[PDB]
């Protein structure tokens, strides 16, 4: 049998006509019923002798379009989720008896879609390989369920959940998880939901806090004897930024003539051989502490 | 819903009445249909304005008993196996619509019952422990199936088979088997078939052929010296009867003064000690050969 589909709030026309009417055969009455599937309840009746009858609760939403001996077609207005079910149309005739046809009514609903990030702060620490939630994509109260997916360059794993609501709509939820990293920071994650031929997209960017990646600038390989005023600068790539800096060497402390001031190691000069060595910067932010090195050799 | 049952050839009354008729509600038409279970075909229609309509193939077997605005009751006459199925009765009314009720029709049939023996000859031989068929009890073309069982003092095993006929009747067959024996001969075997509260019984007696059970009569323990005219008689219980008799002794042949003539060993006399010994009769029938013994001691 036929299947009709319509969205909540719209109207459907349910066709029902009597094929080959004969001079012999006479149409007595045309009857629409709804089977909520054992239960038959009467919806609307058309009797040529007595006119039209639409029963509650359909009195304001149902109507015959062109009620006649041959046409029992009706419009069901302002669809409701509960309109779903099987509809039977019956022509009672004499002396030949009953002729019935059936159809299925499915009611459809467009979902409400939205992405959301975690309220938690994302942290990237070595030794932390824990995958965590970074975003949730929801398609709520749709029918049939929509398809949810993700667009991103991030390398994570998505989990999917489908909730069957009491009213027959389905909520689809996807949860995106990854182990937070320095490279993930500021990067984008989009959730995509496909319903029929519609396509919804919403994006967000990740905020990921990570310990310092430190490098040392300043040594140009031309630190010649007697040169004046050279310095090393500790570059701490850190989110949030480093709060604290500490300089040391591989063999002990700093030499006389080398002064530390936060991220800078000043070599006032004149440069001499006793300044060669390996200089280390230890940088600290709220996430952790990391070191960086530079090997200084004195030239000329 | 209701279930009706009737035997082939009988009539059933299928009830259908409209409960609480109101001044408001008006009955348009009463319709009987048969659902052979997807298919609805029209059986009979009653329309107050236009009268009665019974459709083929029901024109001579269906009739409304008291056709009115409230009563759609019909008689289905001379039941046929194919009448089985679901019957729907529908009151079309205005402005309230359709009211239907259903019922199941099951058609019943009494079986034809009979016992029968094997055409084979039953044989009892030592070393033959083969169970064989001795009787078959059939209950043919019944609906529902009848219960088949056996009454007998014999110690055998019954096998049961149920054949589902194309028309929906069931044939029940039971096969009785036993290893044939001398004691089974002439003994009775009855098959019993219960249908509803009826009880059918039919008996037969077994004919079993067996080799000879031989005993020796004639020695009275008073075979005193010089006694004249005594004899031994070989009694062969055999079916069919023994055809042949042979006498011998444990130690050789017969003594002078002892003459054999079929089942008789004549001791003419006078009796003397040389006549003591063990005398054997070997009796043969179409089934086998068996021996019998008697120890003769001479007295006084």
Coordinates of C-alpha atoms in Angstrom, one line a residue, chain B:
Chain B
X1 CA -12.8 -12.5 19.4
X2 CA -15.3 -15.4 19.1
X3 CA -14.5 -18.8 17.7
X4 CA -17.2 -20.9 16.1
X5 CA -16.9 -24.6 15.4
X6 CA -19.0 -26.9 13.3
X7 CA -18.7 -30.2 11.5
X8 CA -18.7 -30.6 7.7
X9 CA -22.2 -30.7 6.4
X10 CA -23.8 -28.9 9.3
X11 CA -25.1 -25.3 9.7
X12 CA -23.7 -22.5 11.8
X13 CA -25.4 -19.3 12.9
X14 CA -23.0 -16.3 12.8
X15 CA -24.3 -13.7 15.2
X16 CA -24.1 -10.0 14.6
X17 CA -26.2 -7.3 16.2
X18 CA -25.9 -3.6 16.8
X19 CA -25.9 -2.9 20.6
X20 CA -27.3 0.4 21.7
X21 CA -29.1 2.0 18.7
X22 CA -29.7 5.7 19.2
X23 CA -32.3 8.1 17.8
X24 CA -29.3 10.0 16.5
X25 CA -27.4 7.2 14.9
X26 CA -28.8 5.7 11.7
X27 CA -27.8 2.3 10.2
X28 CA -26.9 2.5 6.6
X29 CA -25.9 -1.0 5.7
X30 CA -24.8 -4.3 7.2
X31 CA -22.0 -6.2 5.5
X32 CA -20.5 -9.7 6.0
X33 CA -17.1 -10.4 4.6
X34 CA -14.6 -13.2 4.7
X35 CA -10.9 -12.7 5.2
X36 CA -8.9 -15.6 3.9
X37 CA -6.3 -13.9 5.8
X38 CA -5.2 -10.9 3.8
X39 CA -8.0 -11.1 1.3
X40 CA -11.4 -9.6 2.2
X41 CA -14.2 -10.8 0.0
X42 CA -17.9 -9.8 0.3
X43 CA -20.3 -12.5 1.5
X44 CA -23.7 -10.9 2.1
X45 CA -25.1 -7.4 2.4
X46 CA -28.3 -6.0 4.0
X47 CA -29.4 -2.5 3.2
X48 CA -32.6 -1.3 4.8
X49 CA -33.4 0.8 1.7
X50 CA -32.6 -1.7 -1.0
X51 CA -33.0 -5.1 0.7
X52 CA -30.8 -8.2 0.8
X53 CA -27.8 -9.2 -1.4
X54 CA -26.1 -12.5 -1.1
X55 CA -23.1 -12.9 -3.4
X56 CA -21.7 -15.9 -5.2
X57 CA -20.6 -18.4 -4.2
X58 CA -22.8 -18.1 -1.2
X59 CA -26.2 -17.6 -2.9
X60 CA -27.6 -21.0 -1.8
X61 CA -25.9 -21.4 1.5
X62 CA -26.2 -18.0 3.2
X63 CA -29.2 -16.2 4.6
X64 CA -30.0 -13.4 7.1
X65 CA -32.3 -14.8 9.8
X66 CA -34.0 -11.6 10.9
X67 CA -32.5 -8.8 8.8
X68 CA -33.2 -5.5 10.4
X69 CA -31.6 -2.2 11.5
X70 CA -30.2 -4.0 14.5
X71 CA -29.6 -7.6 13.5
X72 CA -27.2 -8.9 10.8
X73 CA -27.2 -12.5 12.0
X74 CA -26.7 -15.1 9.3
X75 CA -26.8 -18.9 8.8
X76 CA -24.0 -20.5 6.9
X77 CA -25.4 -23.9 5.7
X78 CA -23.8 -27.2 4.8
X79 CA -20.3 -26.4 6.1
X80 CA -17.3 -27.0 3.8
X81 CA -13.7 -27.4 4.9
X82 CA -13.0 -24.3 2.9
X83 CA -15.4 -22.2 4.9
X84 CA -12.7 -22.0 7.6
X85 CA -11.4 -18.5 8.2
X86 CA -12.3 -15.1 9.7
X87 CA -15.7 -13.5 9.2
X88 CA -16.2 -9.7 9.6
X89 CA -19.5 -8.1 10.2
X90 CA -19.7 -4.4 9.7
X91 CA -22.5 -1.9 10.5
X92 CA -22.1 1.3 8.6
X93 CA -23.9 4.1 10.4
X94 CA -24.3 7.9 10.0
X95 CA -23.1 10.2 11.3
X96 CA -21.0 7.9 13.6
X97 CA -19.4 5.6 11.0
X98 CA -18.4 2.0 11.0
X99 CA -18.8 -0.7 13.8
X100 CA -17.3 -4.1 13.1
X101 CA -17.0 -7.4 14.9
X102 CA -15.1 -10.6 13.9
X103 CA -15.1 -14.3 14.5
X104 CA -13.2 -17.4 13.5
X105 CA -14.8 -20.3 11.8
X106 CA -13.2 -23.7 12.3
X107 CA -14.7 -26.7 10.4
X108 CA -14.4 -30.2 12.0
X109 CA -14.4 -33.6 10.5
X110 CA -14.8 -37.1 11.9
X111 CA -12.1 -39.6 10.8
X112 CA -12.5 -43.0 9.2
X113 CA -11.0 -45.6 11.6
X114 CA -9.7 -49.1 11.0
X115 CA -7.1 -51.6 12.2
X116 CA -5.3 -54.1 9.9
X117 CA -2.8 -56.9 10.5
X118 CA 0.3 -57.6 8.3
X119 CA 0.0 -59.7 5.2
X120 CA 3.3 -61.3 6.3
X121 CA 3.5 -64.5 8.3
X122 CA 4.9 -64.0 11.8
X123 CA 7.7 -66.4 12.8
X124 CA 9.2 -67.1 16.3
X125 CA 12.8 -68.4 16.2
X126 CA 15.4 -68.4 18.9
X127 CA 18.2 -66.0 17.8
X128 CA 15.5 -63.8 16.1
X129 CA 15.1 -60.8 18.3
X130 CA 14.0 -58.6 15.4
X131 CA 10.9 -56.5 16.2
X132 CA 8.5 -56.6 13.4
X133 CA 5.2 -55.0 12.4
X134 CA 2.1 -56.8 13.6
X135 CA -0.7 -54.3 13.2
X136 CA -1.5 -50.8 11.8
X137 CA -4.1 -48.5 13.3
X138 CA -5.3 -45.6 11.1
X139 CA -7.5 -42.7 11.7
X140 CA -7.9 -41.0 8.4
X141 CA -9.0 -37.5 7.4
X142 CA -10.0 -36.2 10.8
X143 CA -10.0 -32.6 12.1
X144 CA -8.7 -32.0 14.6
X145 CA -6.5 -35.2 14.8
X146 CA -7.8 -38.0 16.9
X147 CA -5.8 -39.8 19.6
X148 CA -4.6 -43.3 18.7
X149 CA -3.5 -45.9 21.2
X150 CA -3.4 -49.6 21.9
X151 CA -5.0 -52.1 24.3
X152 CA -3.2 -55.4 24.7
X153 CA -1.3 -57.7 27.0
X154 CA 1.5 -57.9 24.4
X155 CA 4.8 -56.3 25.1
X156 CA 5.6 -54.2 22.0
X157 CA 6.5 -50.7 20.9
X158 CA 4.1 -48.4 19.0
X159 CA 5.2 -45.8 16.4
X160 CA 3.1 -42.8 15.5
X161 CA 2.8 -40.8 12.3
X162 CA 0.7 -37.7 11.6
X163 CA 0.0 -36.8 8.0
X164 CA -1.2 -33.3 7.2
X165 CA -3.5 -33.6 4.2
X166 CA -3.8 -30.8 1.6
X167 CA -7.4 -30.1 2.8
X168 CA -6.3 -29.5 6.4
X169 CA -7.6 -32.8 7.8
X170 CA -5.0 -34.9 9.6
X171 CA -4.5 -38.7 9.2
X172 CA -3.1 -40.4 12.3
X173 CA -1.3 -43.8 11.8
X174 CA 0.1 -46.0 14.5
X175 CA 2.3 -49.0 13.8
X176 CA 2.6 -51.7 16.5
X177 CA 5.8 -53.8 16.5
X178 CA 7.1 -56.7 18.6
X179 CA 9.5 -59.6 18.4
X180 CA 7.2 -62.6 17.6
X181 CA 7.0 -65.3 20.2
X182 CA 5.2 -68.6 21.0
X183 CA 3.2 -66.9 23.7
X184 CA 2.0 -64.1 21.4
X185 CA 0.2 -66.6 19.3
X186 CA -3.6 -66.2 19.1
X187 CA -3.3 -63.3 21.5
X188 CA -5.3 -60.1 20.9
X189 CA -4.3 -56.6 20.0
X190 CA -6.8 -53.7 19.9
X191 CA -6.4 -50.3 18.5
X192 CA -8.3 -47.5 20.2
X193 CA -9.1 -44.1 18.7
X194 CA -10.5 -41.2 20.7
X195 CA -12.1 -38.3 18.9
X196 CA -13.8 -35.7 21.1
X197 CA -15.8 -38.0 23.5
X198 CA -16.2 -40.8 21.0
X199 CA -14.2 -44.0 21.4
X200 CA -13.6 -46.4 18.6
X201 CA -12.2 -49.9 19.2
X202 CA -11.3 -52.7 16.8
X203 CA -9.4 -55.9 17.7
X204 CA -7.5 -58.6 15.9
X205 CA -5.6 -61.8 17.1
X206 CA -2.1 -62.6 16.1
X207 CA -1.1 -65.8 14.2
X208 CA 2.5 -66.7 15.1
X209 CA 4.4 -69.7 13.8
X210 CA 7.0 -71.2 16.2
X211 CA 9.3 -74.1 16.2
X212 CA 8.5 -77.2 18.4
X213 CA 8.5 -77.1 22.2
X214 CA 8.9 -80.8 22.9
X215 CA 8.2 -82.8 26.1
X216 CA 8.2 -86.6 26.6
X217 CA 5.2 -88.4 28.2
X218 CA 4.9 -92.1 29.1
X219 CA 7.4 -92.8 31.8
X220 CA 5.5 -93.2 35.1
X221 CA 8.5 -94.2 37.3
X222 CA 7.0 -97.6 37.7
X223 CA 8.7 -99.4 34.8
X224 CA 9.3 -102.6 36.8
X225 CA 11.2 -105.6 35.6
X226 CA 9.2 -107.8 33.2
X227 CA 6.5 -105.2 32.7
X228 CA 5.0 -105.4 29.2
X229 CA 3.8 -102.8 26.7
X230 CA 5.0 -99.4 27.8
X231 CA 5.8 -96.4 25.5
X232 CA 7.2 -92.9 25.2
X233 CA 5.2 -90.2 23.4
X234 CA 6.8 -87.1 21.9
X235 CA 4.6 -84.1 22.5
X236 CA 5.6 -81.3 20.1
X237 CA 3.9 -78.0 20.7
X238 CA 4.4 -76.5 17.2
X239 CA 2.8 -74.1 14.8
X240 CA 2.4 -75.5 12.3
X241 CA 2.5 -79.0 13.8
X242 CA 5.6 -81.2 13.6
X243 CA 6.1 -83.0 10.3
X244 CA 8.8 -85.4 11.4
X245 CA 10.0 -87.2 14.5
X246 CA 13.3 -88.9 15.3
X247 CA 14.4 -90.8 18.4
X248 CA 17.9 -91.3 19.8
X249 CA 19.7 -91.9 23.1
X250 CA 22.4 -90.1 24.9
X251 CA 24.7 -93.0 24.4
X252 CA 24.2 -94.2 20.9
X253 CA 21.2 -95.6 19.2
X254 CA 18.2 -97.4 20.4
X255 CA 18.5 -100.8 22.3
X256 CA 17.1 -104.0 20.8
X257 CA 13.5 -104.2 22.0
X258 CA 12.8 -100.5 21.5
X259 CA 10.9 -99.6 18.3
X260 CA 10.3 -96.1 16.9
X261 CA 7.2 -95.1 15.0
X262 CA 6.8 -91.4 14.4
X263 CA 6.2 -89.6 17.7
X264 CA 6.1 -92.9 19.6
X265 CA 8.8 -95.1 21.1
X266 CA 7.4 -98.6 21.8
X267 CA 8.8 -100.7 24.6
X268 CA 7.2 -104.1 23.9
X269 CA 8.7 -105.7 27.0
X270 CA 9.5 -107.5 29.0
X271 CA 11.2 -104.5 30.7
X272 CA 14.8 -105.2 31.7
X273 CA 17.7 -103.1 33.0
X274 CA 19.3 -102.7 29.5
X275 CA 16.4 -100.3 28.8
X276 CA 17.5 -97.7 31.3
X277 CA 18.9 -94.6 29.7
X278 CA 18.1 -91.1 28.3
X279 CA 15.7 -91.0 25.4
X280 CA 15.6 -88.0 23.1
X281 CA 12.9 -86.9 20.6
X282 CA 13.9 -84.5 17.8
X283 CA 10.8 -82.9 16.3
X284 CA 10.8 -80.8 13.1
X285 CA 8.2 -78.4 11.7
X286 CA 8.5 -75.8 8.9
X287 CA 10.0 -73.3 11.4
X288 CA 12.8 -75.4 13.0
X289 CA 14.0 -78.5 14.8
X290 CA 14.0 -78.9 18.6
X291 CA 14.7 -81.8 21.0
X292 CA 13.2 -83.2 24.2
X293 CA 14.5 -85.6 26.8
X294 CA 13.4 -88.1 29.4
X295 CA 15.6 -90.1 31.8
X296 CA 14.3 -93.6 32.2
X297 CA 15.3 -95.7 35.2
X298 CA 14.2 -99.3 35.6
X299 CA 12.6 -100.3 38.9
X300 CA 11.8 -103.4 41.0

